């Protein structure tokens, strides 16, 4: 993707994450855990459903048209055949480009949602953590399950840990 | 502590085409081209299966077409080994003649 | 005997395109030459 998260600085996806598209994995004093992020998951799904809504269940009614299978007649039949062949090639083109374009965009929007979640998390942690470059943050303070949970649900107060974190980050 | 951000993956991915790549694997895809029919013109329709009957044969009555001499149909199904004739011959303007019959409604 | 009609038989019309027959009647998907066209409905799959 153009943002460089999915198939980028995030080395691979998690097959064990089956309750959401994006999420958090942590390791702390109490153990190792995994939890999906619902808002970013839903944001991606809503955009894809928006595309589907434009394409699925919206066909157009045609009734009496021209004949499209035929005795040799020459001129007029040449014209009827050419008209239909022209029309099919133009629709076949539209269909091909539509899928190639939407797919490029779908892959880019899903990569974007991953990047947004990462950026949002980074800003939350302020000076209390460092980006390890693989989608992981090293958090420079004791962070139990409730602390990790507060980060995931956007209630993390960085000021609470800042002194502990700064001392750990900036030493020898 | 460590907090890692990530996304899901599946073991059974699907290959799709994009603007920049002929073959890229995504977690899921849906088919946009309908490629099959159930072989019937729709329940709620009045249909006749000529079967062994050739269609043109309905007009002139070989033994085959005995059932279908005066058939009434919304949907008419021709079949492959069907013979329009009992005594060898062919219709002049044959393909043109059938197209008349198919859209007739019956005769 | 148990909306879109083609000479091959009726076809579902949930899909926008169809490869069955250029001859159609009713609310039908549009005839195209491709036999398949996959629309991604998920992110890039990156296993390991």
């Amino acid at each position, epitope marked *: 993707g153009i943002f460089g998260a999915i198939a980028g600085f995030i080395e691979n996806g998690w097959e064990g994450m089956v*309750d*959401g*598209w994006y999420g958090f994995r942590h390791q702390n004093s109490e153990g190792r855990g995994q939890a999906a992020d*619902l*808002k970013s*998951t*839903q944001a991606a*799904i*809503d955009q*894809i*459903n*928006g595309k*589907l*809504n434009r394409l*699925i*269940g*919206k066909t157009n009614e045609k009734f009496h048209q021209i004949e499209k299978e035929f005795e040799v007649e020459g001129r007029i039949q040449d014209l009827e055949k050419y008209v239909e062949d022209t029309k099919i090639d133009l629709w076949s083109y539209n269909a091909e480009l539509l899928v190639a374009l939407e797919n490029q965009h779908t892959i880019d929007l899903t990569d974007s949602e991953m990047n947004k979640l990462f950026e949002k998390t980074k800003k939350q942690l302020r000076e209390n953590a460092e980006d390890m470059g693989n989608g992981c943050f090293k958090i420079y303070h004791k962070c139990d399950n409730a602390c990790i949970g507060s980060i995931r649900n956007g209630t993390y107060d960085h000021n609470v840990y800042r002194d502990e974190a700064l001392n750990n980050r900036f030493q020898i | 502590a460590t907090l890692c951000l990530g996304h899901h993956a599946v073991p059974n991915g699907t290959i799709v085409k994009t603007i920049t790549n002929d073959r890229i694997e995504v977690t*899921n895809a*849906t088919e946009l081209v309908q490629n099959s029919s159930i072989g019937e013109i729709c329940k709620g329709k009045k249909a006749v299966d000529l079967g062994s009957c050739g269609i043109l044969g309905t007009i002139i009555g070989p033994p085959q077409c005995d059932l279908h001499l005066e058939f009434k149909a919304d949907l008419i199904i021709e079949r492959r080994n069907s013979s329009d004739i009992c005594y060898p011959g062919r219709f002049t303007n044959e393909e043109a003649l059938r197209q008349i019959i198919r859209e007739s409604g019956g005769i | 005997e148990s909306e879109c009609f083609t000479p091959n038989g009726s076809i579902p019309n*949930d899909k926008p395109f169809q490869n069955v027959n250029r001859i159609t009647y009713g609310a039908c998907p549009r005839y195209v030459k491709h036999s398949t066209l996959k629309l991604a*409905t*998920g992110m890039r799959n990156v296993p390991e």
Partner: antibody
Amino acid sequence: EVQLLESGGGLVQPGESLRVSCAASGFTFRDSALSWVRQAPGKGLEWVSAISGNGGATYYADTVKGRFTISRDNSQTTLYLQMNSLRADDTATYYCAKDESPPIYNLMPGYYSTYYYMDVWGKGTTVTVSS
Amino acid sequence: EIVMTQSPVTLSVSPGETATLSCRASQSVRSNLAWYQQKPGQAPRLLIYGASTRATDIPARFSGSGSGTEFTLSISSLQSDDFAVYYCQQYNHWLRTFGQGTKLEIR
């Protein structure tokens, strides 16, 4: 059997709060969406809100955009609706309604498919707001 | 934020005749549209969803149609128990809206 039962409601003074429960019983595994719809006798139907998965909705009508809040308790299989700052026009028969979507949508089973139609309606609880 | 207007407010139709209802909707709407039959003293019951796809195990006399703005609901063979009120909803604006309601009469 996919019936749900609405409990609560009653008479309340304008400005007070009141939450209505919806015991989701039956076929509903409660990975599907649920909604609330109110109707006052003498008026038509009006969609109120919706819930999805966990905290994916967040979907409220403009009439109650700043007053009503929708809760979901999957452990006890009950849908809630905290109606705060009730006004006079909030008097209605609040219906708890199932939500179904075409199978092409709803990619992840839990999250919200932004196209729902209500199939199984509830018995309804009448809430009267006066002095 | 997307108003629905049904027409008329009430209609009188003899039992047996077809009763066509209207559900005019401001702004385009096609994917999602549901019809309901709320009999007095009862909760609404789903009849058709999407536009034409009727609900499970409902009579075939309930027909649905429409596109974008104008939507119709026709009851083929009318029965004396169809004296209910009918409504129509829409997608989406993340905010579904209902219709005003159409009262159906049966002398």
